[model samples]
Target: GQETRAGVVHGAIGGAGVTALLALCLCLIFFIVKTHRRKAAR
Candidate 1:
């Protein structure tokens, strides 16, 4: 039972980390797109 509980916690933490990374990637992509558009307009 202890092992099962620990496994669940580990999975939860891992899932949260993956979610944060995905959000960061999206933010970076948006910034890059805006930068490129600004450069093109000039």
Candidate 2:
């Protein structure tokens, strides 16, 4: 029983890691695009 619970917890943690990585990538892209636009305007 403990092993099964641990496995589930580990899977949940892995899923959260993927979610966080995607969010970080999206934020980085958003800032990069914004910066590029600002430079082009100037």
Candidate 3:
């Protein structure tokens, strides 16, 4: 199943893309929170 594997959403590299997307999503949250903390520090 070309669609069953993982990549380009079609079957090229979607799984990895999703992995980074997920990680970046969460990382952005923490990154923003850290910025808020720094703001409060001042």
Candidate 4:
């Protein structure tokens, strides 16, 4: 039972970490695209 509960918690934290990283990467990409477009316009 302990192993089962620990596995669940471990998976949940790993999922959270992955989700946060993905969101951060997306935001970084969005800003980069915006900046590149602005510079291209000039």
TM of each candidate vs. truth: 0.52, 0.52, 0.45, 0.54
Each model's C-alpha lDDT?
0.66, 0.67, 0.68, 0.68
So what's the TM-score on candidate 2? 0.52
Query: Which stretches in model 4 have alpha-carbon errors above 4 Å?
Result: 1-12, 39-41
Q: In candidate 4, what are the lDDT values of residues 1-42, reduced to their tens digit?
A: 224456556554656567678788888889888777776446
Model 4 error, position 14 (Å): 0.5
Clashes of 3: 5
Q: Residues 1-42, candidate 3, lDDT per residue (tens digit)?
A: 355565446533555667788789889989988777676446
CA RMSD of each candidate after superposition: 5.1, 5.1, 5.1, 5.0
- State the lDDT at 27 in candidate 2: 84
Worst 10 residues of 2 by lDDT: 1-10
For candidate 4, the TM-score is 0.54
State the lDDT at 33 in candidate 3.
Answer: 84
Give a tens-digit lDDT track for model 2, residues 1-42.
Answer: 224455546554656567678788888889898777776546
Worst 10 residues of 1 by lDDT: 1-10
For the record, the alpha-carbon RMSD of candidate 1 to the native fold, in angstroms, is 5.1
How many pairs of residues in model 4 come into backbone collision?
Answer: 0
